[PDB]
């Protein structure tokens, strides 16, 4: 409807994949060449299904901060035919506070799903589902079961993937550039 939709559908369009694993359909963002980002309780295996097609896994690692912290975000390396458009010129440099922002999901549930969340604050340490979890953002939309993984942007940067919500919050865990250093 307006600019932060435009920067939300182009990611949308390019960006993202369909993710398939033995806990469900995910919203999965790829950054460069056959390097893509889940939430870490997808529990990602040697096999994912990509838009419905069998793929290797070539390499997964769970993020966690220099406490030991886990941060909820999953790096997969797919051994797929084709790169996606490198992203990381829009990934914030450091934790923020964000106005105006979009979610955007894409599954079998929820194609072409676009919501305006408004205010993202550096909401910090959550325990999310009983584990500590650290550079949570907060925004005040009841999300529901099925938008985990969802692209969390403003106009011009792509500052989060979707991880939790309790009924009247979402929660994203921060991308940052540092994390798709090669």
């Known amino acids: 409807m307006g600019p932060g939709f435009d ?7 390019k960006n993202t994949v369909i993710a398939r ?10 950054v460069y060449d056959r390097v893509a980002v889940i939430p870490t309780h997808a529990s990602v295996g040697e096999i994912i299904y990509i838009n419905d097609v069998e793929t290797r896994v070539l390499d997964a690692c769970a993020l966690r901060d220099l406490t030991d912290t886990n941060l909820e975000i999953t790096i997969v390396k797919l051994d797929r035919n084709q790169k996606f458009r490198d992203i990381r010129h829009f990934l914030p440099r450091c934790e923020d506070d964000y106005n105006d922002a979009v979610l955007s999901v894409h599954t079998s549930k929820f194609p072409n ?22 550079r ?5 939309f009841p999300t529901r079961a099925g938008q985990c993984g969802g692209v969390v942007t403003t106009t011009g940067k792509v500052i989060g ?3 939790g919500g309790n009924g009247a919050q979402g929660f994203a865990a921060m991308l940052l550039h540092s994390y798709f250093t090669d």
């Open 7 to 13: 920067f939300a559908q182009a990611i949308m369009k």
């Open 21 to 30: 694993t033995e806990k469900g359909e995910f919203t999965m963002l790829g």
């Open 113 to 134: 799903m676009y919501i305006p969340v408004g205010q993202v604050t550096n909401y910090g340490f959550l325990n999310l589902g009983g584990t500590p979890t650290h």
């Open 136 to 140: 949570i953002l907060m925004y005040n």
């Open 161 to 163: 993937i979707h991880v």
